[PDB]
Amino acid sequence: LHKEPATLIKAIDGDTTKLMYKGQPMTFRLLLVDTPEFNEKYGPEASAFTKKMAENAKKIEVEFDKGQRTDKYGRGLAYIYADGKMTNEALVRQGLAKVAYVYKGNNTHEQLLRKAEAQAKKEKLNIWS
Ligand SMILES: Cc1cn([C@H]2C[C@H](OP(=O)(O)O)[C@@H](COP(=O)(O)O)O2)c(=O)[nH]c1=O
Ligand SMILES: [Ca+2]
């Protein structure tokens, strides 16, 4: 997989963000994770976490997987990096997302994320508390 440039347009919630990619505004949904909706428990904490991570970054990158690049809602499907740190992974490590929506052929980082989830669960963090 390859990292490609993007810039933050606006935070949306724990697992979606609006980025400019190839010069066009796009909503990106984070591959392989599910954060609680803002209305749910830890939803606000997930939103805050992804917003902080994206806003504080000097460099955002998007990395598409091997499969579909947009979902049925027109959202881009990617792994999103903030100064080289994967947001998808960080959310899972902090107990603010669950590994989820693992579709065949867009699942390159599945096992990296499952390892983070195991750690977060061991520490009883957030969702796992
Ligand atoms: C993460 C992801 C979600 N989706 C679709 C499946 C879900 O459909 P439904 O809307 O029919 O439930 C929805 C979940 O996204 P959200 O968790 O953002 O709601 O997005 C994909 O199709 N591919 C993906 O990789
Ligand atoms: Ca969600």
Swiss-Prot record:
Domain of life, per lineage: Bacteria
Encoding gene, per UniProt annotation: nuc
Name of the protein in its database record: Nuclease A
Location relative to the cell: Secreted
Compositional bias segments (type: Basic and acidic residues): 109-125
Shown stretch of the complete protein: 89 to 223 of 231
Residues engaged in binding Ca(2+): D15, D34, T35
Region ranges (Disordered): 109-129
Active site per database record: R29, E37, R75
